[PDB]
């Protein structure tokens, strides 16, 4: 039963994250989230996550370092429940999240001027999963 609970919590944090995006991408991520039934959900989450990773890196090179922060924080508050659900449907669904989320933050860290410690752990967690 708790699958539905964790799905609404992932639906909530991702919505709050998407609200920090431009309206062009905030439309597709929002339609993919709400037109995916209940078993493509994790696929839509990984789709919305891949579009978000695509979005936040462009704004990070622009100077929108505050929107990327506010957006990723909402990605963070649902990162554990998304991995648990993705692990419930398949070990590959777990691994897809890091390759999105881990790769997202890594490029976000590799863009901001002036911690390599976090970049370091993110790379190995990617390697250890690969």
């Amino acid at each position: 039963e708790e699958r539905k609970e964790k799905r609404e919590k992932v639906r909530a944090g991702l919505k709050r994250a998407i609200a920090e995006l431009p309206a062009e991408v905030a439309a597709r991520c929002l339609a993919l989230l709400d037109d995916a039934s209940d078993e493509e959900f994790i696929e839509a989450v990984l789709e919305v996550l891949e579009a978000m990773r695509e979005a936040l890196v462009a704004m990070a090179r622009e100077g929108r370092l505050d929107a990327v922060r506010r957006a990723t924080s909402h990605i963070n508050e649902v990162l554990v429940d998304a991995a648990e659900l993705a692990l419930e449907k398949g070990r590959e669904y777990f691994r897809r999240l890091c390759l999105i989320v881990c790769d997202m933050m890594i490029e976000l860290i590799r863009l901001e001027p002036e911690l390599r410690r976090i970049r370091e752990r993110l790379e190995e967690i990617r390697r250890r999963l690969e």
Binding site: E84, I118, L122, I125
Partner: peptide
């Protein structure tokens, strides 16, 4: 098992948002 990596990712991810730009 794998759930630890998830908790490690929020931990690492929450630290990224803390000490990002400023």
């Amino acid at each position: 098992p794998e759930i630890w990596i998830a908790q490690e990712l929020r931990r690492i991810g929450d630290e990224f948002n803390a000490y990002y730009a400023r």
